[PDB]
Design a protein around this ligand. Structure first.
Ligand SMILES: O=C1C[C@@H](c2ccncc2)CN1
Ligand SMILES: O=C1C[C@H](c2ccncc2)CN1
Ligand SMILES: [Zn+2]
Ligand SMILES: [Zn+2]
Ligand SMILES: [Zn+2]
Ligand SMILES: [Zn+2]
Lengths: 286, 131
């Protein structure tokens, strides 16, 4: 029994030296015997590898005292409709030095904002994990042709995450004390959140009694939506996957049952606008 | 395409710690709320006639210890997150780590909570000959 979370996407045929492998599964077969691993004199460590590790498959089903649930019920989401931000991500595929994972490319929100990131992944090395630009290509097919020019218009992730915090803060500061990301088939949106979300116990802002919605790696401080200028991470967001409410077909077909003013322009922000709009019609209309 | 590194019993804890502002505190809290320690570490077969030093080039477990691959006992390596070191490099990856047998059910938790003596090379409270 294995999971795809942290799958090694490199094209190296062999596994790792026992001192460098993060796990028993990842150790090369040559070192495995009698249920465990052995050090083999004369078989050295590898001092130049770069192995892309997949961030697909996160499971946020922990129950830890003092840490809030990220995924919330339909009833809780309805009470916080003013915090709703539709979110969708279109990805690109790892290629060349790696294969088998999706990297965020276009991040779209129900505010109409699309942000484009440089294709970036988590590459294990002999010394650490290097968060770095990786070779990538858009998926093939006419439905993904619009992503081709985006491969060379991306911004570094340190810039993208500041822009996400600023957009959320400007949109929500007078509407809610939180954000609820409204999603449709959440797996890749949750993988993309790894690049701009941090979690922990509920905290208060560094300038008021409001709950903290943002975190700064510059000072290790917390802020609400009003005091987050320059902050780089979204802190303790909430989310809900609308697809889990009993719909059968794709997003567009279910959205179109209640709404006709949102035409499909095939872009991340459009999917994010449709997801929020479908949730609003399902919970508040008639 | 690709080769799995992880097992499902570790998905929740690694996801929780991969998103935390403070991963070490998150792992400690996860255990205190009843979670299972991280498994699928790299445990070595050895002769248990080693020096007993904490961090070594080859396995050095004495009869009171077990030897593990160093990266596999490092929370930051297991979650593929930043190390809290100044230059962001790991002191366990590329070495073997000796862990007291009584603590070998949670090697990751052991390395997070304990300190190596720089004078004698042994863990403080678990072998250090200085104090
Ligand atoms: O004997 C082996 C281990 C395997 C591997 C699994 C996970 N990560 C890297 C490599 C490939 N060859
Ligand atoms: O009261 C509102 C709702 C509106 C909005 C629209 C789409 N996504 C998020 C928020 C902004 N102001
Ligand atoms: Zn504030
Ligand atoms: Zn609509
Ligand atoms: Zn490490
Ligand atoms: Zn000592």
């Amino acid at each position: 029994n294995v999971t795809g979370l942290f799958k090694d996407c490199s094209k190296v045929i062999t596994g790792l030296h026992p001192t460098q492998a993060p796990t028993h599964l990842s150790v090369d077969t040559k070192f495995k015997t009698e249920g465990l691993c052995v050090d083999i004199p004369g078989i050295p460590k590898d001092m130049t590898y770069r192995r892309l590790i997949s961030m697909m498959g996160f499971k946020m089903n922990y129950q830890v005292n003092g840490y809030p649930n990220m995924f919330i019920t339909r009833e809780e989401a309805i009470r916080h409709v003013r915090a709703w931000i539709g979110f969708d991500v279109e990805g690109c595929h790892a290629t060349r030095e790696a294969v088998g994972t999706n990297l965020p490319l276009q991040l779209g929100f129900s505010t109409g904002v699309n942000l484009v990131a440089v294709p970036t992944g988590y590459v294990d090395t002999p010394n650490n994990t290097d968060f770095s630009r990786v070779s990538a290509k858009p998926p093939p097919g006419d439905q993904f042709k619009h992503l081709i020019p985006l491969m060379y218009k991306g911004l570094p992730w340190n810039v993208v995450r500041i822009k996400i915090v600023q957009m959320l803060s400007d949109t929500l500061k007078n509407l809610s004390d939180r954000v609820v990301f409204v999603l449709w088939a959440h797996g890749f949106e949750l993988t993309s959140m790894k690049y701009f979300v941090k979690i922990g116990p509920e905290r208060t802002c560094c300038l008021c009694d409001r709950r903290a919605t943002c975190f700064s790696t510059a000072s290790d401080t917390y802020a609400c939506w009003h005091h987050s200028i320059g902050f780089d991470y979204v802190y303790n967001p909430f989310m809900i996957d609308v697809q889990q409410w009993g719909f059968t077909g794709n997003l567009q077909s279910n959205h179109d049952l209640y709404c006709q003013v949102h035409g499909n322009a095939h872009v991340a922000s459009c999917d994010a606008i449709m997801t929020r709009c479908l949730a609003v019609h399902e919970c508040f209309v008639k | 395409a690709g080769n799995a590194t992880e097992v499902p019993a570790n998905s929740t804890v690694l996801s929780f710690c991969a998103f935390a502002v403070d991963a070490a505190k998150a792992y400690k809290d996860y255990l205190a709320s009843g979670g299972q320690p991280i498994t699928n570490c790299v445990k070595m077969l050895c002769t248990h006639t080693g020096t007993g030093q904490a961090i070594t080039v080859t396995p050095e477990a004495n009869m009171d210890q077990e030897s593990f691959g160093g990266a596999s006992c490092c929370l930051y390596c297991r979650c593929h997150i930043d190390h809290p070191n100044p230059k962001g490099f790991c002191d366990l990856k590329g070495k073997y780590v000796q862990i007291p047998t009584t603590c070998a059910n949670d090697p990751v938790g052991f390395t997070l909570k304990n300190t190596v003596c720089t004078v004698c090379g042994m863990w403080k409270g678990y072998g250090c000959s200085c104090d």
